[PDB]
Amino acid sequence: DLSLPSFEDDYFVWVDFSEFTLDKEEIEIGSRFFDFTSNTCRVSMGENPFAAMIACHGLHSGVLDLKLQWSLNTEFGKSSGSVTITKLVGDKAMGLDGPSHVFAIQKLEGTTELLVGNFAGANPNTRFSLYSRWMAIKLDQAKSIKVLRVLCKPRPGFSFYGRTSFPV
Amino acid sequence: GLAGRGVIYIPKDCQANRYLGTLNIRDMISDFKGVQYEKWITAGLVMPTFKIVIRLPANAFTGLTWVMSFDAYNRITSRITASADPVYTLSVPHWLIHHKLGTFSCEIDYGELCGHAMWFKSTTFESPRLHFTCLTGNNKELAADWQAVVELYAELEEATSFLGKPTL
Amino acid sequence: GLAGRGVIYIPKDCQANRYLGTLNIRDMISDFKGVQYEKWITAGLVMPTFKIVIRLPANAFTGLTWVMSFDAYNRITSRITASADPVYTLSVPHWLIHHKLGTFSCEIDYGELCGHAMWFKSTTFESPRLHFTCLTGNNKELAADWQAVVELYAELEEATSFLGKPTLVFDPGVFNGKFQFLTCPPIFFDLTAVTALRSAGLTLGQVPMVGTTKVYNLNSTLVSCVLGMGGTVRGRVHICAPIFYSIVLWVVSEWNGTTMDWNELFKYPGVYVEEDGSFEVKIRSPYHRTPARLLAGQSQRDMSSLNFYAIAGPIAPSGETAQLPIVVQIDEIVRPDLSLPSFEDDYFVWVDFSEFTLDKEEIEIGSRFFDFTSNTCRVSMGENPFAAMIACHGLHSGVLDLKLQWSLNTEFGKSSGSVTITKLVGDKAMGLDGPSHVFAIQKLEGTTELLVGNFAGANPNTRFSLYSRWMAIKLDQAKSIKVLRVLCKPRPGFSFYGRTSFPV
Amino acid sequence: GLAGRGVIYIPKDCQANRYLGTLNIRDMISDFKGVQYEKWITAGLVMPTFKIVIRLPANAFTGLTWVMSFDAYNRITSRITASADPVYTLSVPHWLIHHKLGTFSCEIDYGELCGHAMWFKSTTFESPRLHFTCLTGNNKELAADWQAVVELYAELEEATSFLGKPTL
Structure with missing residues (x-):
């Protein structure tokens, strides 16, 4: 006799960025779904079953749809700049240019896809270096942002390999 | 056929929660x-x-x-x-x-149980282990230290793909 | 019947890499x-x-x-x-x-191979050439200078259309695994060596170089359309030496370096090559695939390579001194294990404009897809497979959907003006007015189509002047823009004619 | 399958009656x-x-x-x-x-050709050899020293008897 599922087929919180100390901020994502750290701003990670499933398998692979939302710290009339999504294939140094995307800060939201995977076919739950698509979020007026929230919604067929555990 | 083997050493007084050793499958x-x-x-x-x-x-x-x-x-x-x-x-x-x-x-x-194929020359992600631990201890110590033998039987054939079928 | 002829003069000492001459087909x-x-x-x-x-x-x-x-x-x-x-x-x-x-x-x-029809009275785009070069040299000079004769046979009939059938149609998700005209530069073995190794990298998306010059070509461009590849390399080996030279090769694939143990080497799945012939070797890798391109600080030897081990010879009579050359051709990846396509059916970056110095800026596009230059602002061009495909064909034609995005440099409340898309048929001077479009700067984005083509049917990859539709981007408050980004997405059926290359 | 291998070294001047080497089959x-x-x-x-x-x-x-x-x-x-x-x-x-x-x-x-079965751990009678000699020499020396590779292919299976069938 089961209850409702706790989550619906919807977005959930991946990460909130807040309390920016520098106007120039660049968050590298690459091809991973993982926990962020920053010396220049406050990272607040989401906790949900998807994140746990990532942590409880040796390998995973799939596509995440992202929704970015943000509110302003300064007056709207004074606002300038952008949330920019850099999309490459390769790396920052030698990569090819994909569907990079400039959201004027006044849009206050934006969407993008993220490939979680690589040429080999799957990601370990650690840092690794394997040729793949590469993503980054670039803020140029970060101090004007009170919060940048990133939600994700896995596309059907997001796959996990080799059940295991994760002590923290 | 027999593919590999190893030995676990049991102490005469085998208490609950005693770590007995780890075998490295490869x-x-x-x-x-x-x-x-x-x-x-x-x-x-x-x-x-x-x-x-x-x-x-x-x-x-x-x-x-x-x-x-x-x-x-x-x-x-x-x-x-x-x-x-x-x-x-x-x-x-x-x-x-x-x-x-x-x-x-x-x-x-x-x-x-694992999901990725094993490369003959080196560990790809992490190195697969078998751990042997004691769950419930002996009621009284035995006469002397002893050992158990662990054996791997397999008929190894060339893997067609890098990835297994997803557990989840 | 015999349509034309020409003569190539060979010198008595024909060294590898010698230029012999060019014939002009017309x-x-x-x-x-x-x-x-x-x-x-x-x-x-x-x-x-x-x-x-x-x-x-x-x-x-x-x-x-x-x-x-x-x-x-x-x-x-x-x-x-x-x-x-x-x-x-x-x-x-x-x-x-x-x-x-x-x-x-x-x-x-x-x-x-070319794509456009030949006009009797003059060259239309550029003049078609046949180049003759020496790939592997003679073992010792010959007795004297000589010549070879080149002959064109054809039954010329009137062409019904200007354009041929397209060699290639743009599709991100389509790289079969079959190649044409993929020939590796010659590999050389010294006869002063009892054994030897020569590696050929299998990171085929890498752009080949000659000194500091990048040589963009269709094959590497195709491979770059994928993230990586595994499977079996089917190719042909040519042994380019006199009948009195001979060699035996063990050809096998290895990952990240080579083994130093001869016994391990022969436990791998390789093939022996004693003479001209075809070969199939499995691409060997921990991931069953090798990546299509390298990341920073990586080397091609760090991945999967096709290795040529001289296990007996080369030998020759004394006193020969020439190395024994092997020319390898790769025909296809059979039984392919491909990665995801590197790009999806999506937009990609064409160009970013930034750092505007004047408030009035006008970027002419016309009917071309090309590299911009400006004295008054910073141009940053995108690099992707589509752009390479444009550069690796003589002609192309199609329609691009454009997305324009921009962010403000000044305060939003102070903003004024527009990103205006001028669309004409003709030119700025005598043109007709099409779906020109005024985007108030506050929209912060806009869309439009661009015809890449003209009345004749296709564009060369150079500047040209042929009546067509004409587009321009007009900024009136450009200093208020921190960046103007232009993305494009080719509509199905974007066509390329006549595979070629593009050195820069 | 390939069972064993070895290398014979040929001198540039390979005269008649020249001894090239012996390979030990086992x-x-x-x-x-x-x-x-x-x-x-x-x-x-x-x-x-x-x-x-x-x-x-x-x-x-x-x-x-x-x-x-x-x-x-x-x-x-x-x-x-x-x-x-x-x-x-x-x-x-x-x-x-x-x-x-x-x-x-x-x-x-x-x-x-031999008559007795081979014991894995040691030579039984004497140790079986392949000798490589030059019967007729080269007409003039070659350009440089070289080598040839000798390979043994076999599908070894357990021998039922010690002795073969008699040659004579």
Whole structure:
């Protein structure tokens, strides 16, 4: 006799960025779904079953749809700049240019896809270096942002390999 | 056929939560070296179905129960080598080994339980381990220290793909 | 019938990389002049199927191998006339001419390999050339200078259309795994060595280089359309030496370095090569695939390579000194294990404009897809497979959907003006007004279509002037813009004509 | 499959009667070690049918002809190491290797040519050798020293009897 599922087929919180100390901020994502750290701003990670499933398998692979939302710290009339999504294939140094995307800060939201995977076919739950698509979020007026929230919604067929555990 | 082997050393006073040792699956096969090991070098990649056999003198007078834990991604190793809490040892795929039943056997479809194929020359992600811990201790110490033998049986053939079928 | 002819002069000491000469295909036909030349004048336009024949005294005692390179768009000429690196000569459609086989022949469907029809009175785009270069040299000089004769056979008839059938149609998700004209520069073995190794990298998306010059070509461009590949390499090996030279090779694939143990080496799945022939070798890798391109600080040897081990020889009689060359051709990846396509059916970056110095800025696009330059602002061009495909064909044609995005440099509340898209038919001076479009700067984004083409049907990859639709971006408050980004997404059926290369 | 291998060194001036080297058949298999070598350890005794392959660049411009002599009982080794009289090299089972024909191959039914089965751990009677000698020399020296590769192919299976069938 089961209850409702706790989550619906919807977005959930991946990460909130807040309390920016520098106007120039660049968050590298690459091809991973993982926990962020920053010396220049406050990272607040989401906790949900998807994140746990990532942590409880040796390998995973799939596509995440992202929704970015943000509110302003300064007056709207004074606002300038952008949330920019850099999309490459390769790396920052030698990569090819994909569907990079400039959201004027006044849009206050934006969407993008993220490939979680690589040429080999799957990601370990650690840092690794394997040729793949590469993503980054670039803020140029970060101090004007009170919060940048990133939600994700896995596309059907997001796959996990080799059940295991994760002590923290 | 027999692909690799190893030895676990049991102390005469085997208490609950005693760490007994870790076998490295790839080392078992390479140290043996091995009709199967040599087939492996030619295949390059293997996605074995192992039969694991633990040889073990059956005894109904001890109360001893052990746990073999399959840790393909080396996630609990660091935390059990002083003392193996059951919460760690049961958090990954595992099997109960009852002393009253003697010699123990099980199947590991490396395609499911692990998910990635093994490369003959080096560990790809992390090195797959078998941990042996004591779940319930002996009612009184035994006469002397002893050992059990762990054996890997497999017919290694070349793997067609890097990835297994997703567990989830 | 015989349509035209020409002569290539070979020197007595034909060293590898020697430039032998260039024949101009249209001049061969017009200087001959020519029952076929006269039929041509009446036709106006011709789309010939040529049989090219090179007459050439067969000889098994030299080791000479030449390359005929079909350069319909005059892309490698400048860079080969002093000396001909094989990276240039093999970057366009080409044929190996082995001296042991004597007289050589091949077909050139000008409709495919070139794409546009030939006008009797003058060159339309660029003048089509045949280059003759020496790939592997003679083992010792010959007795004297000599010559070979080049002949064009064709039955010219009037061409019905200007354009051929497209060699390639843009699709991100489509790289079969089959190649044409993929020839590796020669690999050399010294005879002063009892054994030896020569590696060939299998990271095929890497752009080949000659010094500091990048040589963009269709094959590497195709491979870059994928993240990586596994499977079996099917190819052909040519042993380019005199009959009195001989060698035995163990050919096998290895990952990240090579084993130092001869016994381990022979437990791998390789093949033996004693002579000219085809081969299949499995791409060997921990992931079953090797990546299509390298990341920073990576080397091609760090991945999967095709390794050529000389296990017996080479040997030759004394006192020969020449190295023994091996020329490898890769035909396809059979039983392919491909990665995801590197790009999806999505937009990609064409150009970013930034750092505007003047408030009035006008960017002319017209009907071309190309590299921008500005004295008044910063242009940052995108690099992707589509742009390479544009650069690796003589002609292209299609429609691009554009997305424009921009962010503000000044305060939003102070903003004024617009990003205006001017759309004409003709030119700025005498044109007709199409779907021109005014985006108030506060929209912060806009969309439009761009026709890449013209009344004739296709664009060359150079500047040209042919009546077509005409587009321009007009900024009136450009200093208020921190960046203007232009993304494009080719509509299905974007077509490319005549595979070639592009050195920069 | 490939069971063992070895290398013969040819001098640039390869004169008639020149001794080129001896390969020890059991050492070829054990140094390689060897899917077949490992099958051998389990069988204990083997009565192989070998395919011997000598890899060798074909050349019609030398006049070189070599002799491979199968000396299973080590009878001529002593008398051929400084110089190899054809009377010795041809007095045991042997094969002519013509340089014009390139890569050479033959079958050795160890049951006939030898007569006793091979024991994995040590030589039983004497240690079986292949001798490589030059029968007719090159017309003029070649450009440089070179080598040829000798390969043993076999599918080793357990021998049922110690003795073969009698040659005579």
